Structure formats: C-alpha cells, structure tokens
Design a protein around this nucleic acid. Sequence first.
DNA 1: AAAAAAAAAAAAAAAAAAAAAAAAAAAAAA
DNA 2: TTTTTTTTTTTTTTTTTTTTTTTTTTTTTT
Lengths: 104, 521
Amino acid sequence: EPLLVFFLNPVSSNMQKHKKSTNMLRELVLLYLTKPLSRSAAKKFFSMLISILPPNPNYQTIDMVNLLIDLIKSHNRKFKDKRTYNATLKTIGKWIQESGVVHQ
Amino acid sequence: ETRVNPRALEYWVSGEIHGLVDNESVSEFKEIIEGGLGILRQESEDYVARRFEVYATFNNIIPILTTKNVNEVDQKFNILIVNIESIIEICIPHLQIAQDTLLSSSEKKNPFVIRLYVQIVRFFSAIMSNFKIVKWLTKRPDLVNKLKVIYRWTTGALRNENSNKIIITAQVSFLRDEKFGTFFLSNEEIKPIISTFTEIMEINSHNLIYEKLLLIRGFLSKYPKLMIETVTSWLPGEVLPRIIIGDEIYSMKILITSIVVLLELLKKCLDFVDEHERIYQCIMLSPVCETIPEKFLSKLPLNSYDSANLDKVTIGHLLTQQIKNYIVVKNDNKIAMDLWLSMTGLLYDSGKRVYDLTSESNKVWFDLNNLCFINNHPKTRLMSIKVWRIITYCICTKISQKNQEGNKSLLSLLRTPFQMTLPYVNDPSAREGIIYHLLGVVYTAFTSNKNLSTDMFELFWDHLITPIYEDYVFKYDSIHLQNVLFTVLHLLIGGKNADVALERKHIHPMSVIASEGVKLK
DNA sequence: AAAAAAAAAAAAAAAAAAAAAAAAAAAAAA
DNA sequence: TTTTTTTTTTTTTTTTTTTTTTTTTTTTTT
C-alpha cells in the first residue's frame, strides 16, 4: 500500500515532497530484511512488487524509481539469497530497467 | 501467415505439433480440440497413425488449477462440455480396441498401442477430475451412464492379462483424481472398484506401491461408508503387509504412507464405531494365513517356530515386534508411537473391547511405551505421554458401568503416566505431559460426555480424581505445576477464570484426538 | 359452460469467509 | 557442522445468508 503512494505522489509535483520521500524510502528497506534472506520471500514479495510498475508517463516519478532500484541492486551483490531463487532475483533488472530506458 | 489449419490432415505432422504458444490464455485452443475430434471419424488410412498425436496434445494444452485466473480453466473446459456427445461416440471405442488388443496375449509390449493407451487414459482423467464438468453432468444422466463404462473395463484391466507398471499407474492416478463417483456412482457400483485394490499384477517397483497407497486416501475421504464396510479386504491384503516386511524390501516413503492410511480411517471410522468388530477379528483374534495372502507372506522375514505355526501368530504379535525394532535399533521413536496409537483406538472403540486394555497379553503395549520413555530426548518423553489421548477417549466414552471392577482397573491404568513422570518432576517436559493428559481426562469424562447421570460421576470421582490428587498431585514441590492442576477445579464449579476465548471451544469427544489436545478455555 | 392464463407467498440450493488442519519452508539445535 | 520443528500459507467445510422456484387460486378463451 505505502509503496504504491511512494510512486504517484509527484502527480502534484512539489520537490519538497520528493526531497524527504527518497531519503525515507531508503531507510524503510534498510531493516525490512534484517534476517538472512528467506527462500520463499525471494519469490512471494518479488511477484506482487512487480505487478504494478507504471505510470509509464510522469517524468518526476521515474527519477525516484531509478534512485531506489540500484539501492536494492547494491545489497543484491553483498548478502543476497544463499542459493534458491538466484535466476528470478536478476529478472528484477530485465523488466524494471526496460521501463527506465523507454520513458527517460 | 496463419494457415496451419484446425482440421483436415495439415496440422499434426506424423509425430508432433501441439500449440502451447498464443493459445495459452486464449479461447482459440477450441479448434485444436474440436479439430482432433473430427480427425477421429474412422477413415483410417492416414488417420490411424495420427491417433497417437491428437491424444498427446490434449495432455499438453490442458491447464492446471491456475489461482491467478481460475476462469482460463473454466473457459477451456467450457468447450468440452459442449463437444462431449462426440467424445463419447469415438474416444470410448478407440480406448476399448487399444485395451482389448492389450487384453488378448502376454508378449504385448508393442510401443504403438501401449504409448497411445496411456495418453488416452490421461485425457479422460483430466476430464473427470475437473469439478465444473462433474456439476454439469447432472443435467443429462444418459451421458453419465454411457461414461460409467470406463470403470467397468478398468476394473478388469488391473487383475487380468499383462497389466504393465505404466497401465496400472495411469488407471490409479485417474481413480485418485476422478471425483466423479461421489455424485454419479452408487455405493454398490463402487464395490467392483474396491474389489481390485487387493488384486493387482505384482511388480513392487516403488512408483507403483506409492500411488496404490495414495488411492486409499482419496477413497477414504470421498467414500468412507464404503471403505469401512470392506476394510477386511484392502487393509490386511495390501496395506498392512507393507509395514511388517520392513524398510529394507521397500523405501521409508512406502512405510510412512501406509501409516497415514491408518490415521485417515481413524478420523472417518469412530463415526461408525465398527459394530461389525472387523478390527479385533482380522488382527488380534486371527493368525496370518486366515487374512494375509501368500503374495506378501513369501516376502516376509520369519524367525523361529512362528514359521511352522502361522496358525498361532495373531497379526498383533508380529506388529508389536516390528515397533520394538524402531525404538531399540533405528531410534524412529515418532514412527513407532504414531503407528501404535492408531491401532489401539480402532481395535477397542467397540464398547466391550475397551476392557481388553487390562489383559496381561495386551500390557506389552504399555511396556513398549515405557521403553520409549526411558530414552534421553525430552520431546520423545513428552510424546510418549501425548499419545494417551486415545486411552482416555476409549475408557471415558465407550464404557459400561455394569463392569464395576473393570472400570476401576482401566481408571487405575490411566494414571500410569503420573507413575512414570513422578521421579522426573525436575524436567520441564515431564511436568507438561501431566497437564496435557489430565485436560483430556476432565474434558472427555465431564464436558463432552453428555451421559453423566449420578453413576458415571461416582466412578470418575472417589475411584479417579481422588486417586489422581491424593496419590500424585499433593506430592509435587513444583508450585507453578500445582497452580495449573488446581485451576481446572475452579472451571468445573463456576469460576471460569481461564481466558475462555479472548481472540486466538471444544465440546465433542473427537476434539481430544488433536495435536494441541484441549485447554483450560 | 370448461381450460387456460395471471399473481401471492412459502419454500429450497449453494457460494463466501474464517478456524482448524496440514504443508512448505524456515528456525532451531546438533 | 547439518537434522528437526514451527510460522506462514493453503484447503476444506461449516454457518450464514442469499438466490431462486414452485405451489397456489381468479377470471376469460379452448
């Protein structure tokens, strides 16, 4: 629910809203996965968190998505998945970045 | 350019071409199916070879349940419920000629017809197992009774000719997934099916026993009244020998699956009590050669005079021996006790057999529990008390006041866990087993027993609660244990200060059979 | 004139949601 | 150093509540 709002709040612009949002959206996920990566979660949360990536329009929203997607991709190199959903964990880059190089 | 054609001869080449691309999630899948049914219209110069491929692709463009969209299933199967009259004029005879050419000889491992026969059986299985087809069939019973011929031939195709490992597995997976009979076969139309469970062509390739035991599950939960009336056949003939022969002739998967079938019958047979007394008759009264077929006895690890006196070895003896090796050799303490449980309940639910618990020939079952309880593992020590839930249920539901000293003897044996745990009161798990047991006693004798009168209560009091509390409870220095053991008294008199239901309420005797058992609430 | 339509007013079938039950996988103890 | 069990998830089946049909009975055409 709140991650849906983290996308569309720039419909009414206000860089004062963005300037606090991107800072808090980093610290939200910093502790979401404090325990050493459940195998099932690497497919369960992974599947619904990609079922709604648009708007494909909205220039000042995609700024926020490109700034957060490589913060995730940073820990996906450090202490990811101790085997299991390796393959699907990199398909996150294949369709998300397809958006970020079609509307930017 | 789209020109593959849905009909004629152009689509299926002579070995492949299916259509799992743009017809996945799309209605147009229709013309591959309704196409193939048009190709089955006899003729049989070019169309005979191509009979192998049409029943292959039918097992490929069919969906699974797909929770993501249960409607793609609904809409793909909505073509079949319209085409069905055509499936019945051709696919039934095309199966029958493939079956009967496979039911005329012995050398018949012919890869044309036998590779087709399995593919046409899968095609019917996926039609029957679809529940929406089952609700729809009630609209026309003419078709129900035409379709009913599948079982009338399948029941011969298990116990006759050269029924191969693959032919059996395809027919058993069909009967496991079928669902159809519950709304379209009478109880007597089903007895010809159960009649085959004992009579199968022998090849204990593990594959085949695994699916055979899983069929018994589906049949117990969808056909309980029918399975119980016939238990004297399929249990001793083909399930019960699987455990006794041991792990070595099999694989642990097989042994565990034949233990689960015992628990399922228990969750569907106390409903009917077995007033026919089949249990004690075919197992503890009867020896080996009265109920076990030679088919399994030649494979059996016999030992001494027992091999020459199969007339005297009642099935309960040889079962009791095999349970003894699990604890003392393997350390398989859970498998030994969960098995042991299921037999004692079924055997003694009969309202006269409850008293057989007092007999010295039967106390070897308590000794067997004691040999588990002397082991190190606190979880094993708790579990060897967690099992006593059945001993409460039999002694406190199916009891008859008339046998005054019989009741008194059962009520004395029922305190045996407290005698075992008395030196072990230091241990956490040994304290907890006292509470779990005692909740089940109280619940079953007073809360779920409606028939308390005056007379039952007197047995449950100065012959039971007083001997519990004076001889065990008033001797434990464990104050937090005593706090809980006295709380159950407040509940029974009128102060129900024990949460009852905040958020996160047992009343029928089955409730004590559960893994959590019963609570103060 | 007799049979057919028109309208009260009870009656019968079945899908949803949550508890248990039970499974996968994850948390614990070697 | 790897075996064993518990929370999250799945499925059955109640228990409510709704959908729905079929009997009942006046006034005109078979």
